């Protein structure tokens, strides 16, 4: 069973480093049947935008662990809030980075 | 010795008050947190 793992990142270079990291950790650990597909989601500036992006393409990817980074503008730190919401609504933990 | 890791403006205001007054001499030492040291409270920072 493929596991799509979703990583919330800001520049494209973070997406390519994330996906090569996943490739290296698939070549590191078990790859016979546990093979992870890295998927990368950019930063939209709205928490309901985040909710909608993690719901329209990740929760049907069947994500096992989201990945979250600090909000661009440190005036209100509410970016990881909806994603912790959606993880925890069945109590899946978040990987705060 | 004082200690607080909070918002920067409070930092800054404490630093200004200690500067206008006599609390930067040899004896008034304290520790500071992470982000209060980058910005306006780094301009108002003491020497040491």
């Amino acid at each position, epitope marked *: 069973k493929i596991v799509n793992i979703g990583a919330v990142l*800001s*520049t494209r270079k973070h997406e390519q480093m994330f996906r090569e990291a996943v490739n290296q950790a698939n070549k590191r650990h078990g790859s016979w049947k546990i093979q992870l597909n890295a998927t990368s989601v950019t*930063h939209k500036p709205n928490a309901i935008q985040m909710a909608l992006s993690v719901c329209e393409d990740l929760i049907s990817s069947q994500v096992y662990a989201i990945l979250v980074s600090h909000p661009p*503008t*440190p005036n209100d730190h509410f970016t990881p809030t909806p994603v912790s919401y959606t993880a925890g609504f069945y109590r899946i933990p978040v990987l705060g980075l | 010795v004082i200690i607080l890791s909070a918002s920067e403006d409070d930092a800054a205001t404490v630093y200004r008050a200690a500067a206008m007054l006599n609390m930067t001499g040899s004896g008034y030492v304290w520790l500071v947190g992470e982000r209060e040291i980058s*910005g306006n409270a*780094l*301009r108002y920072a003491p*020497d040491g």
Partner: antibody
Amino acid sequence: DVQLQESGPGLVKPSQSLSLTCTVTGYSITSDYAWNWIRQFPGNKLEWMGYISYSGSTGYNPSLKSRISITRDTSKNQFFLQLNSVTTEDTATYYCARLYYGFYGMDYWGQGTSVTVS
Amino acid sequence: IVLTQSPASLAVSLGQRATISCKASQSVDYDGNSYMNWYQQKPGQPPKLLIYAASNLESGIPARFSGSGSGTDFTLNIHPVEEEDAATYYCQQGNEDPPTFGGGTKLEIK
């Protein structure tokens, strides 16, 4: 190695918003550092307008409290400067210089570029 | 306030003193530590910070450009004077809004 890249219209029109653009290469705009915009005169007179911090703080001259703005984008590591309510007298050299946020280090200035108004 | 510099048409030989002072509007120096940086620029390259805090030299320059200052008057001195001493000197303050800059002092080695 971190360096800065200039860009702009090069010839602004009367009552037209000056749109400058500066790129950072080798680091990030949100992590650290602050960026000032300076208009150098031919008589060796640097005239700083305003600066943007990595936390989203726009500190500029009080005379420009309603006709200046600095925006940025982190996905492409870029930042724009918008100067409104401009007049004919703007012939100078633009510099998107970099000063460590908190008035700490003046390391990387850039190259800037001359500009006239006509 | 336009900061004043002095002198502007001096003539310093090789070996003697090259004192260059400048006056601001109010007391830039506060709590002992100065806040009057000294920038040396060569025409053709962007300016650079040469002396920070008006009493400390950054890592990368030998101990030639020294100086001090307080209140309004801040002084930069060169010991010894070399061929690269001839440049454009700007003393600059960055305390609060608006951080106005200094004028321009032209120094020529004889």
